[PDB]
Design a protein around this nucleic acid. Structure first.
Length: 158
RNA sequence: UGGAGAGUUCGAUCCUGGCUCAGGAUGAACGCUGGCGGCAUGCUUAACACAUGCAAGUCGGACGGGAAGUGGUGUUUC
């Protein structure tokens, strides 16, 4: 029971001496609004078959988003994947999802209803939709920072 | 409590990169149209040249007076 939506249907064509043929590509993102996303890129001859294969690749690369709070992000994070750079900042329980055309499509599925961002560098829908995934994977919460951090011998509780 | 972009240079892709558009604003003009009210505002172009009227006068409890107007029969006022 996951929600499915398309980002961009790109037209990629190569010319041979045998004519002009194309293999359509589509980016589909999945989600259940509880804090679970997954992007998928699939290439096929037709438009309907390119959306189908990208939906099967989306439910395979499943990553958990550690948001769980009052419909917002835990902290500030800046990640750069290639030429594309996206900045994700937390917001108050009244702001909408003021993020990019390829960024808002992955954030509405993550459960984050309150978020503010910017689209820097390259404005390609392929490199920016995956740059937000690398930025959401490196997200830490108050409990897992202290568990990642190796504190010395403190007083042990039962 | 604050920070959404997209189109176009390729057969096509990913970069770089210029250009263009969506917004708000402006003591604005033009075109079409046009019911009022409240508040604000109005040569931003020649500090160009200007008819007319008006925009600084007021005091006689500062004086010699009294040409007008009003009383009394000489004081207001001027």
């Amino acid at each position: 029971g996951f929600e499915e939506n398309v980002v961009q249907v790109r037209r990629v064509t190569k010319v041979v001496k045998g004519g002009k043929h194309m293999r359509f590509r589509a980016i589909v993102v999945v989600g259940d609004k509880k804090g679970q996303v997954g992007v998928g890129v699939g290439k096929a001859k037709e438009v309907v078959s390119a959306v189908q294969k990208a939906a099967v690749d989306a439910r395979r690369n499943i990553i958990t988003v550690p948001m769980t709070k009052y419909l917002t992000f835990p902290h500030r994070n800046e990640a750069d994947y290639g030429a594309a750079r996206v900045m994700l900042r937390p917001a108050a329980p009244g702001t909408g999802v003021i993020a990019g055309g390829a960024v808002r499509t992955v954030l509405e599925m993550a459960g984050v209803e309150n978020a503010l961002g910017k689209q820097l560098g390259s404005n390609n829908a392929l490199n920016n939709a995956r740059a937000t995934i690398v930025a959401v994977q490196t997200m830490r919460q108050f409990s897992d920072v202290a568990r990642d951090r190796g504190i010395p011998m403190e007083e042990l509780w039962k």
